[PDB]
Amino acid sequence: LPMLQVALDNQTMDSAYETTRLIAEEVDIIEVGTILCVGEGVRAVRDLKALYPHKIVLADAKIADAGKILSRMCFEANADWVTVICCADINTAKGALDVAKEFNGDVQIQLTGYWTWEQAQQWRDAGIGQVVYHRSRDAQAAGVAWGEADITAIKRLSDMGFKVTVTGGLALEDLPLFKGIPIHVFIAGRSIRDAASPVEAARQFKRSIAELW
Amino acid sequence: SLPMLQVALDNQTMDSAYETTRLIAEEVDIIEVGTILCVGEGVRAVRDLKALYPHKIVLADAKIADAGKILSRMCFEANADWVTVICCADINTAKGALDVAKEFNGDVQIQLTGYWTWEQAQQWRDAGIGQVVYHRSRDAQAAGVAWGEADITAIKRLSDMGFKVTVTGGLALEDLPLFKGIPIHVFIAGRSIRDAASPVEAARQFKRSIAELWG
Ligand SMILES: O=P(O)(O)OC[C@H](O)[C@@H](O)C(O)NO
Ligand SMILES: O=P(O)(O)OC[C@H](O)[C@@H](O)C(O)NO
Ligand SMILES: [Mg+2]
Ligand SMILES: [Mg+2]
Q: What drives induction of this protein's expression (chain A)?
């Protein structure tokens, strides 16, 4: 089954803990959001992995350059996975991946904004096994909806051999769009954190995923 | 005008950054909180460095990729003057960051790290972005990528489009003459200042060379 990931897009640890204290055990992966990485720094990764060592922790650092340096910082803070932004030089993804292997972790390419199919082939040739297909929140706010072009692109990435994560303002009702595709992870940030009942929101996601896959 | 000099504080902790700034804060024009320091310490790095050096321009090199308004606002509430947005970001990300920047009488630079297109550049101009950072990736550098002709051509084209262009990426003193004759807004030096035997003298050498080349 597709795993469920909660995005902790919080500015401070105490704000993040307001969410984790409700739903840490209701999800498979705990993401330190980019907002939290910039707010608190990599202590957020160290702290959350110490709290939830049995969970996969993702540092959503969106690394753009200095792949080995920034990756090592996250992995030394005990991240399982790190993100590299899609426009990074290929050597940045390669550098992050080399460090990830030292820690038995993994690298995901975050597909936020502009990227190309040639770049996608480079990631595959470099040994990258995970991509995050992301509808940007700012695109969403400008009226961009999930659509058939997304489903097509997601299928194409899956066929290239990537494990695909899907994210970007996902609501419970969006899940059936992706049916039949071997999605690795669905991320929910707002739709879990900001729900009247975060526990219900997480359980509904898990229920629906179980129903559909 | 002479190109200004910006120090990149790509340190993992505040105390390491201060080992540099206590030497060169008054020897450079712009103090950058490097992406490595934003990730190492969080946005308190911006707040603390601006409190130390409130007369200096402080750049938060956050390389914002999405959530332009939220991430911009965090940096500006920490008293940043400038923030970076990564070149692949949705155009509405750049716009959102710029909207917030205007509230704080700050500014946004697009960081040209990695892959981007001339269509995207026209979009940034049309959105009201007035600065770009032309960057040779350190990982590209380590893979043997040198500065050269194609860079000069693109930097000129960016300047002609109306951007103030910052040049950065493993710059050494010996690289500066490649850019002579171009109205460069800022040169950034991270490693070549921080890691010098004498950071003060490294900064001063950059300043002397710049004054010779653009004087
Ligand atoms: O479900 P959302 O609130 O859209 O958050 C998930 C998304 O993937 C973010 O964490 C993110 O990385 N935005 O850039
Ligand atoms: O002079 P460097 O050590 O290359 O550092 C300057 C560069 O602009 C970095 O701060 C950076 O942003 N790298 O992505
Ligand atoms: Mg995220
Ligand atoms: Mg920088």
A: Induced by L-ascorbate. Repressed by UlaR.
Mutation probe of ligand 2 site: the residue of B86, B138, B174, B191 with most atoms within 8 A of C-beta: B138
Tokens of B184: 């460069």
C-beta separation of A188 from A28 below 8 A? no
Q: Does domain B1-215 have CATH number 2.30.110.10?
A: no
Residue A193: closest CA among A205, A185, A184, A210: A205
Directed axis angle between helix B14-24 and helix B44-52, to 10°?
20
Q: Please answer yes or no on whether A112 and B88 come within 8 Å at the CB atom.
A: yes
With an 8 Å Cβ cutoff, are A39 and B68 in contact?
no
Would you call B87 and A87 a contact, using CB atoms and an 8 Å cutoff? Answer: yes
Which of B66, B77, B168 should be substituted to probe chain A, the one whose Cβ sees the most A Cβ atoms within 10 Å? Answer: B66
Residues 6+ apart with CB under 8 A from B85: B63, B64, B65, B68, B93, B94, B97, B108, B109, B110, B111
**Residues flagged as binding site of A for substrate:** 9, 190
**Has B32 been labeled as part of a binding site?**
yes
C-alpha to C-alpha distance for B125 and B113, rounded to whole angstroms: 18
**Tokens representing B135?**
């960057």
Atom 13 of ligand 2: nearest residue by CA position: A65
Chain A hits for B138, CB-CB cut-off 8 Å, are 65-66
Please name the fold of domain A1-213: TIM Barrel (3.20.20)
Of B10, B74, B142, the CB nearest to A38: B74
A7 touching B (Cβ < 8 Å): no
Count of H helices and E strands in chain A? Answer: 10, 8
The reply to whether B12 touches chain A by the CB within 8 Å rule is: yes
Nearest to B38 by CA among A43, A56, A77: A43
Of A64, A67, A86, the CB nearest to B63: A64
Give the technique used to solve this structure: X-ray
SS (H, E, C) chain B: CCCEEEEEECCCCHHHHHHHHHHHHHHCCEEEECHHHHHHHCCHHHHHHHHHCCCCEEEEEEEECCCHHHHHHHHHHCCCCEEEEECCCCHHHHHHHHHHHHHCCCEEEEEECCCCCHHHHHHHHHHCCCEEEEECCHHHHHCCCCCCHHHHHHHHHHHHCCCEEEEECCCCHHHHHHHCCCCCCEEEECHHHHCCCCHHHHHHHHHHHHHHHHC
Going from N- to C-terminal start, the domains of chain A cover 1-213
